[PDB]
Design a binder for this molecule. Sequence first.
Ligand SMILES: *[C@@H]1O[C@H](CO)[C@@H](O[C@@H]2O[C@H](CO)[C@@H](O[C@@H]3O[C@H](CO[C@H]4O[C@H](CO)[C@@H](O)[C@H](O)[C@@H]4O)[C@@H](O)[C@H](O)[C@@H]3O)[C@H](O)[C@H]2NC(C)=O)[C@H](O)[C@H]1NC(C)=O
Ligand SMILES: *[C@@H]1O[C@H](CO)[C@@H](O[C@@H]2O[C@H](CO)[C@@H](O[C@@H]3O[C@H](CO)[C@@H](O)[C@H](O)[C@@H]3O)[C@H](O)[C@H]2NC(C)=O)[C@H](O)[C@H]1NC(C)=O
Ligand SMILES: *[C@@H]1O[C@H](CO)[C@@H](O[C@@H]2O[C@H](CO)[C@@H](O[C@@H]3O[C@H](CO)[C@@H](O)[C@H](O)[C@@H]3O)[C@H](O)[C@H]2NC(C)=O)[C@H](O)[C@H]1NC(C)=O
Ligand SMILES: *[C@@H]1O[C@H](CO)[C@@H](O[C@@H]2O[C@H](CO)[C@@H](O)[C@H](O)[C@H]2NC(C)=O)[C@H](O)[C@H]1NC(C)=O
Ligand SMILES: *[C@@H]1O[C@H](CO)[C@@H](O)[C@H](O)[C@H]1NC(C)=O
Ligand SMILES: *[C@@H]1O[C@H](CO)[C@@H](O)[C@H](O)[C@H]1NC(C)=O
Ligand SMILES: [Cu+2]
Lengths: 550, 544
Amino acid sequence: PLPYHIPLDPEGSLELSWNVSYTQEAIHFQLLVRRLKAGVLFGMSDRGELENADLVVLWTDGDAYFADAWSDQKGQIHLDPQQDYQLLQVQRTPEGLTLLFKRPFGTCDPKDYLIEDGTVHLVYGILEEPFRSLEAINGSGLQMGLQRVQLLKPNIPEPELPSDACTMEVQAPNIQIPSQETTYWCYIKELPKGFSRHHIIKYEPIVTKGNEALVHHMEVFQCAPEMDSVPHFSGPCDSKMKPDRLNYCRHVLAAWALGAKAFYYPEEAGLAFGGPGSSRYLRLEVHYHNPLVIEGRNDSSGIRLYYTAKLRRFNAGIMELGLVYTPVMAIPPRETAFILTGYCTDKCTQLALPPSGIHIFASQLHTHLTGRKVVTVLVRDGREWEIVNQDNHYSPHFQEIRMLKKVVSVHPGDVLITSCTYNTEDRELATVGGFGILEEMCVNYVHYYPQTQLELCKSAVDAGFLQKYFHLINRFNNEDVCTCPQASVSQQFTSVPWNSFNRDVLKALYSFAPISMHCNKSSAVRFQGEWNLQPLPKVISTLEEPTVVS
Amino acid sequence: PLPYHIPLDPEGSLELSWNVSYTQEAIHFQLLVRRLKAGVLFGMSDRGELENADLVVLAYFADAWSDQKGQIHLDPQQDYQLLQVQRTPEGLTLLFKRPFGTCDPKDYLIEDGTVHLVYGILEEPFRSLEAINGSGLQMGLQRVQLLKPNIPEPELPSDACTMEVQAPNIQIPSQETTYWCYIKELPKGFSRHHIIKYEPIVTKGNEALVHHMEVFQCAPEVPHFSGPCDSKMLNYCRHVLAAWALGAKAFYYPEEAGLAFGGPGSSRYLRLEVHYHNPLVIEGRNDSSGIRLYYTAKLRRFNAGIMELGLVYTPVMAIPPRETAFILTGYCTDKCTQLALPPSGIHIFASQLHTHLTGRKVVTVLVRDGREWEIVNQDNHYSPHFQEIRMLKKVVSVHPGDVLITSCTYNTEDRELATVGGFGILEEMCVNYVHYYPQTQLELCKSAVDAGFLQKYFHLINRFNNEDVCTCPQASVSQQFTSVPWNSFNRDVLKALYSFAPISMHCNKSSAVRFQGEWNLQPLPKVISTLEEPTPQCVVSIGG
Ligand SMILES: *[C@@H]1O[C@H](CO)[C@@H](O[C@@H]2O[C@H](CO)[C@@H](O[C@@H]3O[C@H](CO[C@H]4O[C@H](CO)[C@@H](O)[C@H](O)[C@@H]4O)[C@@H](O)[C@H](O)[C@@H]3O)[C@H](O)[C@H]2NC(C)=O)[C@H](O)[C@H]1NC(C)=O
Ligand SMILES: *[C@@H]1O[C@H](CO)[C@@H](O[C@@H]2O[C@H](CO)[C@@H](O[C@@H]3O[C@H](CO)[C@@H](O)[C@H](O)[C@@H]3O)[C@H](O)[C@H]2NC(C)=O)[C@H](O)[C@H]1NC(C)=O
Ligand SMILES: *[C@@H]1O[C@H](CO)[C@@H](O[C@@H]2O[C@H](CO)[C@@H](O[C@@H]3O[C@H](CO)[C@@H](O)[C@H](O)[C@@H]3O)[C@H](O)[C@H]2NC(C)=O)[C@H](O)[C@H]1NC(C)=O
Ligand SMILES: *[C@@H]1O[C@H](CO)[C@@H](O[C@@H]2O[C@H](CO)[C@@H](O)[C@H](O)[C@H]2NC(C)=O)[C@H](O)[C@H]1NC(C)=O
Ligand SMILES: *[C@@H]1O[C@H](CO)[C@@H](O)[C@H](O)[C@H]1NC(C)=O
Ligand SMILES: *[C@@H]1O[C@H](CO)[C@@H](O)[C@H](O)[C@H]1NC(C)=O
Ligand SMILES: [Cu+2]
């Protein structure tokens, strides 16, 4: 058939399957309607709203007619005089009525939606009641929903597993999530004794059948190699009942977030764990968000690993690009698009990268609720070379590990620039970087080869410069005010009255001020050098991108 | 018959005439080639450079475009549509059509305001487009308003009489640029009349030489003079009855108003200034050109007047160096309009935009209750070298309490220092001269940033780029824009200051007196919102 498919409506009366051609630069959609009552509409839109939508509609109104349509800002449906969607075939089968139609990635028509890399928001609706023309169609009698998907796939078959492949299950024991709002939970598991060295070539999530809903992030780590670690453990990650060490495992075997399905490795590489000289226990950290907050729902959740005995050609690593989690990075309220940027500097890459460089075959983008756009680009001496990963339509609810269509080569001395665009319009206060639900993140997880000791390449604004910012706006408020309060970064940001000047000066600060750079190893230690007050990477540059049927 | 016309090349071997259709949303070009050499190319570009241009080249006719280095390539799409190619006594004429805009974003977009036309004459026979070289290529630009309002010529009062102000059959000096003053006069007595029209008079063959023309009234407080305006034979007869520039057909006052000239307070004597642009330095060329006024004895209902909108002239308004686009905004506040405007309000039928050399874009919008309602005037392609009084397509009504927002976009890329507001050539202006009725006592409605807040700017950036936190002696030392270390932060904070800080408001008559009150530190008008931009709806061979 057509290789990709998803359900649209929960009832499954609507099924969408599609295929992509990058030579023709076009998508072929096939829509299956099993049960058609009244009429049905399908299309795509920016955030998945019915408003400002690029659509296709069918009516039963006659004795069955199909037309291209578009919707305005108020959600009213109008016919499309040109056609972006081109109807190809219509056939009636036992499964239902099938419609094959074709669209280019983009049109010279500016009105239409533009298909590109990253997330695409599909809109579907089932119009319950017969309505005629388009414009009669009302919110009433319309079942109106959205589905998120990646329209442009790498078009590669998922490799699958040799006769050697074995499964290892890393799960929490069956533990009680506190009645607190938010919990981040550490657990210590260990490998069988005398465990020879292996490559994890696959992993998939495991979530208890009542909790799919409660568990929104899971991660599996390795502590520093030099060390033989603490006894067996289940419980929260801040507590001091818990020891010393851990805290020392930032090394990353596995990562899962909402929307991410199973992941298969590229065949050039696998992820190495066990064997001599590289060590220990696995640390599982599970993030529980519990608006529910009722008697402890008992949960053993985790990740399943698929591993092969020994080596594929290269060892694959995972690198964290982005903003460090600190309050000093903040988004003012009532912002339509506000951009936070973080960096991997040439100094860090020069220090931590091999002469050959690394090859990025995958990326996963991560923000919190206010995240809208995420992009990572590659820059060489102030000239933008390549786009590592891009999602303009990105949603926090849909976060998946994507195989890059083109593997990207990163060399020492290159700068990796990561930017996230946020919308704070639903927030009355400044949103700050942090672990909390009301706080934000900008992160790009990169899956690359050959493995290096570089894991966190991240940056943040210099604290001192943020302080002079605060004092600058304070004094712009005039009065006189010789006052030097310290820290309370979250408490300073919440205390700032937000006006055009404060916002613009904050944005200016982010676009100007030097950065505290974090270059850290798998060992959860920095690369020696002085990484504070680094000159802000800047780009001298930018890269340029060029009737009704029946 | 095509209503609008301009010369392109100085030699005058190429002449362009055109027609506008707003239902069809298209321009009809007719190109006249008097002398046909190997080739001719014509088109349009942002500032008038050959690079990145939307073109047509020449019986074979082809649509072309130019790349970043200015090399010419064929256009697979075509915006221009060839209609007719015909041979006449005057030369070879080509009638062709182009839409205002295309769904192709690469192509030029025709809109309100100035359009830069590019022309060339190919000396050398070429077998391709890409073969075209600086060699054998005669290259030029012409600035014009492509979309004119469609105004029918009103009937005349029959009382209406014409007075013609022309050069006294004089000889243009051998110079590239000449400005020529001549003094003409009215009969004595002659009580007040309304000018309801004026149109250009240009001697045949001199079309390329005449760039702009202006008719002025001297100060009431005069001897006869014909010759250059720098000649140092005594006057400022500055103030303006009439203005004309290339491409303009006629200027019409609205049915409600006319411009008054007559017995006192009128001045007695009139001054005409004609601008000759003379590349090639032609010589012994005689010119009678000037402007003809249509005026009536019986006044219409209102007297027409001119109001100055914009930035006050102060150094406090500055543009940092090396900016591609930097925006300065002046304001006419709700308090000023509420006070000085009649209850009925005023109606704006015309506008003239004024900046100095670094000016690129200029826009004036009308805002009601903090919401942008209508665009008074817009030029994104505006140039200081072409500035004319333009009739608005739709007369715009400004009521009491409405806010007028005027913004200019500047390019400082060629400047090493901060450019400041001022009269000088190296300093800047943002001004919109508005022609309206009924005439009121409001003459200058203008604004500027509050000086104190600018002081807070200088001390804030000074204390920020100098490093430490929390120290409070604060001795004040440097107050002015020169000597300032411009980096992204300083620029952005200056922009923030301009976008935030309250303004010193000038509501003036007389230039020597303000209106009725305390105008310092007025709250900056702000727009919760803005308005929607209208959508651009989505090798030939002809027998001669
Ligand atoms: C065309 O317009 C002219 C200007 O209105 C009409 O008047 C003629 O103007 C010229 C120059 O102004 C007068 O020439 C006079 O005689 C000599 C010559 O001036 C200079 O000439 C040569 C170059 O031609 C130059 O190299 C010499 O050094 C001279 O300086 C001057 O000394 C006089 O002061 C004065 O300029 C003509 O006399 C004058 N014509 C008449 C009939 O008075 C001219 O008539 C117009 N022509 C037409 C056909 O309409
Ligand atoms: C949204 O639009 C729909 C239709 O445009 C409205 O829903 C309902 O529409 C049906 C059928 O058109 C109405 O039934 C009526 O039956 C009588 C028979 O006596 C017939 O003469 C009428 O012409 C009509 O067909 C039904 O009354 C109507 N529901 C209502 C009025 O509550 C719906 O009301 C619209 N809602 C909004 C918020 O616009
Ligand atoms: C509108 O009219 C007012 C008149 O009230 C103009 O105000 C200006 O007020 C200053 C007084 O501060 C005067 O100009 C300057 O005076 C200072 C001394 O204070 C002197 O050092 C300067 O050299 C300058 O002369 C004057 O009263 C007046 N200036 C002008 C040019 O009229 C205001 O400027 C007017 N606004 C316009 C015409 O846009
Ligand atoms: C990278 O560098 C070190 C390695 O862990 C971390 O520095 C510690 O950070 C914690 C929390 O901010 C402090 O309590 C410690 O005092 C720091 N140690 C030292 C020696 O400064 C740093 O946080 C790491 N950054 C990451 C992992 O993003
Ligand atoms: C997409 O599907 C069409 C018919 O459904 C087929 O002809 C075409 O080859 C397919 N393209 C692919 C699989 O790339
Ligand atoms: C302009 O286009 C052609 C000129 O030949 C003519 O048919 C048309 O009527 C003209 N329309 C206007 C409004 O000038
Ligand atoms: Cu997170």
